[PDB]
Each structure stands twice: as C-alpha cells, then as structure tokens.
Amino acid sequence: SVDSASKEEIAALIVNYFSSIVEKKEISEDGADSLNVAMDCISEAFGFEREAVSGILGKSEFKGQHLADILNSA
C-alpha cells in the first residue's frame, strides 16, 4: 500500500521541471535537447501535453512536496 501519488501527477511535475531547467537555461543546449525529447517521451507514455501540467499539478497538492521544496509546482 504505497502513496507516492499517481504517475500522472508525478510525470507532470517532472516535465514541468525540465521545462523550467531549459527555460532558465540551467543546462547546456545539448543536454536541453536530450531533456526536450525526454519530456516528449514522458508525455508520449502517459498521453498528455507538457503545457497541461497546470491542470494536473493543480490536481495534486501532495502531502510532503506541495511548495517551497519544489517551486515548479506552480
């Protein structure tokens, strides 16, 4: 009986994070490309859009994460 949220909610947080990393350009452009295709494959897997993260993230407040420890929640 785990409670690590749903892979959907997590994936949204995940791709939004990399979208933020490439946004702020905290990573080399070569690595950024690898992140872009990564997020694409992630979104491909669960069948969602990377800009739909808002709807999904707003669906999950979490019980530990939420805010502050991750600023890419919203």
Residues near a copy of itself (CB under 8 A) are 2-5, 7, 10, 14, 17-18, 21, 26-27, 30-32, 34-35, 37-39, 41-42, 44-47, 62-72
DSSP per-residue codes, the chain: ---S--HHHHHHHHHHHHHHHHHTT-S-HHHHHHHHHHHHHHHHHHT--TTTHHHHHTT---SS-SSSS-GGG-
C-beta of 41 vs 52, nearer to a copy of itself: 41
CB of residue 35 to a copy of itself, shortest distance in Å: 5
C-beta of 45 vs 51, nearer to a copy of itself: 45
CB of residue 18 to a copy of itself, shortest distance in Å: 8
Cα separation, 25 vs 23, whole angstroms? 5
